[PDB]
């Protein structure tokens, strides 16, 4: 996964884009703004990726003590371990085991509708959970 | 078809002195008010198997507990019957507490932020911060309430025990005496209340069916007497007014002898009639 | 045919730049590995395809089809020598040969060339002709099912061979920062005139590893017919 | 603790014909067997406020439902009282079903894969795949069970209705007739059962209390007669033997007249003493 700026999308929708809304992360209508742009940087020492918001470049995708993905300053919670499962489809694990499991970005859907859902961090067991699949589109 | 349409208070297992409190669209956690600001009607939708939680606010009558998805915030918004306004009420058996999960995303449940005094969300875990006590508002208001009890025919009079040794019960003018105050206790098992007189450690208001129609207080370490127990029913469209019916014989309401607003008038039971010497004001002693 | 040599025994990672002044001729690279292990070897964009030899000199794997994309996955012993035949780059852009030690699932692919298939844009018949490995030797194919991926949309894939009999193993491919991960989804697939279809996810990547069990033709021709 | 030590079956809200079934450490979803392979003892720990779910397997006696962390798989493993062997039983009120959450990680709950016929852990959603029916195993076994009923004094004879017009109930040799078969149905509200004779549609075993100790079949569109309803209590050490007591007066037990075993012998009610003529085998019709 090359370094650079990406849009981030759920496989449930090709027209909804990851952005912060208050302290949550959600997928929204295309804005063409910096807040839908994500700077992916590989970290050689731990073989993971940190992912910062272009609009707020000192804030990274992280997670809180409540099960939500968040946008925070750098910490070991900001390291993501992706599993590429298709062209530019990924499962995004936290680098750290959480509650001694793999945990992954997870977006809840109601009949494939994700509007207004917050992105959460939930257990991962395999590569087939649709709610854990995300598109990284270079742009 | 058990909680549906019930008006309840909701308090925190992590802090039983904090209740869900609503003012102008804002939901917080606040001490007990015994008024509509902390009352909620549970409105069941049978096809969703989930509930709307609706504020009994007398000014804005259409506000329901709402998750402001995708944020961490909970507020009250106009009822639009939206998924973010429905909640699964999951009773944790053995614990007698509830988890309250969002219908819109059942992985997320209410979390009591007791330091911030407001509501948040969390995935499920074992902490007390996601457990809640849901109680019929009358029980909630009266349980462990220390009150004074007045006939509506003379508010300045009061049901009293006579003294620490004379365990008889008569009417007398309010003088703030401990013999004139009652700590109400709800017994979840018998689904009824007892009135503990505060001049005794274990003296409770007891219908002495033996001498027919009369009422004294006596020891509460007599264990299985269902005349030591009472039912309290709100007189319709009041705030403080109730009927008090005895457990052993629910036709037998607590009665002010003859309607006589006078000192020393006997307190007894009589057959129910909805008639004014059988209505009572239960209030905080000023 | 100027034989060049990587004098230093390579380990884990190595990149060798084609001079460019040797592109107008088939040319060889002599090398050895620091430690015995399974290596992925390829040109810059898997182009051109490479051949590998053991040094007696013995052909191991690889073929020579012009404009055919491929990479080699081979078990290399630190005791022996190895030759890489690079064919004619009839285009004077400078190429690079990449050597990488594989610690993960790609080890399932030794020893074989992996053909990059990139013309599966639709339903209908497709086939691919390469020089056939001898009996008990392997040839692999990495392809992507046409369509957009949604973990639901799916195509019927008929995989078969024309003349040679072969046993196929089908893997599902995912990728991380550490290279490929492989899910072995099917085994013992008899390819010669196979009439059974397989439903595979649109836009997903798969690898078919084929073991030649009967050499009836100099070439092996793999058919991937797609219906919906 | 109202569930502590209870023996239950657990079936799928998604497919009520599928039950949790245990053999040799494997948990699967299987059709009803009415035997120990589908029975589980709920074991409460008050400190964790969570339950072990213990298989009633007769050979391996210490197997409990276990989450195979870090995978999403479930199995039965030896009981070591581990957090991954404890479960929160969360009753979805109004839906009469349970969500069963891992105590070790309540983010995850049991999910019924009805096509692989096994269980896994899953995050929450609003589907019936995460909802289960937990039921006392006796109610589970007998509810909607079509049976024949025999005195233990002679298992070759059955309690029968005489014929379609003759509603009397007597003892007769088993001849496979529908007047000799009864469909048991549990009434949720009454917490009691009826026995519908299969020769009729709406005819139930009834104590004719206005005629002393007589029992007859009569119609079940007589609606509030407790005399139509029965308690069915297992006899210890036995798989098929029950005492059957009348809901109107639970001291009245189904009784074989005299303990006589002759054809025609009266079936009646009598004061309960637990003698052999008040014990009944409820069995599959062969």
Author numbering:
A (entry chain C): 8 to 146
B (entry chain D), D (entry chain B): 9 to 294
C (entry chain A): 380 to 434, 454 to 626
Give verbatim lines from the article.
We next separated the HA complex into two major components: the central hub composed of homo-trimeric HA70 and the blade composed of HA70D3–HA17–HA33. Each HA adopts an almost identical conformation in the independently solved structures, despite differences in crystal packing, suggesting that they represent physiologically relevant conformations. The N-terminal domain of HA33 is fixed in the HA complex through extensive inter-HA33 and HA17–HA33 interactions, but its C-terminal domain is largely unrestricted.
We found that L-PTC/A consists of two structurally and functionally independent sub-complexes, the M-PTC and the HA complex. The HA complex is composed of HA70, HA17, and HA33 in a 3∶3∶6 stoichiometry and adopts an extended three-blade architecture, whereas the M-PTC is situated on top of the HA complex platform. BoNT/A absorption is mainly mediated by nine glycan-binding sites on the HA complex that together form multivalent interactions with host carbohydrate receptors on intestinal epithelial cells.
